[PDB]
Structure 1
Amino acid sequence: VVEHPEFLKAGKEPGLQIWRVEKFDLVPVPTNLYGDFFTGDAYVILKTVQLRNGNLQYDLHYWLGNECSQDESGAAAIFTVQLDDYLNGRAVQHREVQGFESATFLGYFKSGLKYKKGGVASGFKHVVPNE
């Protein structure tokens, strides 16, 4: 369980919700920017579907950009498991890698998917063991 604001807003209504991992945190992407991914970042996508039989459906995808740092891709993966745990585990998890996204993932974006160089910076402080 988490008091994290975004976990409370997750999968409450039919639709698409996108978050970007930023310095070890899940930050919501402006709605108008959906479909634009920074190739150097990592995101978590939650798709909620309306299933007549009052049976809400969830699909969690974590997208990894070619230049995203280890701490980001790791955080995207971990957030996915926690969000799913939060949602009682009812969500099906999917790892999406830049350039090889699943047909399901690509379908979430009517007007195509668009990449763009750049991104937030690693929250990782560099060190060298035994120094």
Structure 2
Amino acid sequence: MVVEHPEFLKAGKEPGLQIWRVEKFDLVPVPTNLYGDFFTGDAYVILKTVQLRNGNLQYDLHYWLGNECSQDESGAAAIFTVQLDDYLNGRAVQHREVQGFESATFLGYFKSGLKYKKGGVASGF
């Protein structure tokens, strides 16, 4: 169960916000400058790393499901969130975020507003 995937190594190394998009059975890091703009036809994974006073880190994993995102993507997102949690010693809290029914917290991360945009990368099947 030990994952050697580069993004897991970079996963939660310091406080901040980290985003990935599911792309044909693989996590790919979104450009820092495109954070907040989501393709409604794809599935994403979001990791919020918060600095605890005890010196340790807090983790909250949110997997976002676009309306038009394919089943391979929705399934991948969920499995990847289950994997990232284990990788970070089961410490993270798993959150399922659907398009339009996001939790206050998840909406709260984006300061300049969360935007949707139609389209998205193809399915892996």
* 3-state SS of 2:12 partner: coil
Which structure is larger by alpha-carbon Rg, 1 or 2?
1
Q: How many residues align?
A: 124
Deviations 1:66-122 (A, max 9, x none): 000000000000000001000011000000000010000000000111000000000
Does the residue aligned with 2:20 lie in a helix, a strand or coil? strand
2:48, 2:96 → 1: CA distance? 14
Please report how far the alpha carbon of residue 52 of structure 1 lies from its aligned counterpart in structure 2 after TM superposition. 1.2
Say which SS state the counterpart of residue 38 (structure 2) adopts.
strand
Q: Deviations over 1:22-64 (max 9, x none)?
A: 0000000000000000000000000000011112100000000
Tell me, in whole angstroms, the C-alpha distance in 2 between the residues paired with 1:8 and 1:51: 20
SS in 1 for 2:55: coil
Q: % of aligned pairs identical?
A: 100
Q: Establish whether residue 79 from structure 1 lines up as the match of residue 67 from structure 2.
A: no
Structure 2: distance between partners of 1:6 and 1:85 = 14
RMSD of aligned Cα (Å): 0.4
User: Per the alignment, in what secondary structure is the counterpart of residue 44 of structure 1?
Assistant: strand
Matches of 1:122 and 1:53 in 2, distance apart?
42
Gaps of 5+ in 1: 125-131
TM-score (norm: length of structure 2): 0.98
Q: Distance between the aligned counterparts of 1:10 and 1:89, measured in 2?
A: 14
What is the rounded CA distance, in whole Å, between the counterparts of 1:53 and 1:82 in structure 2? 25
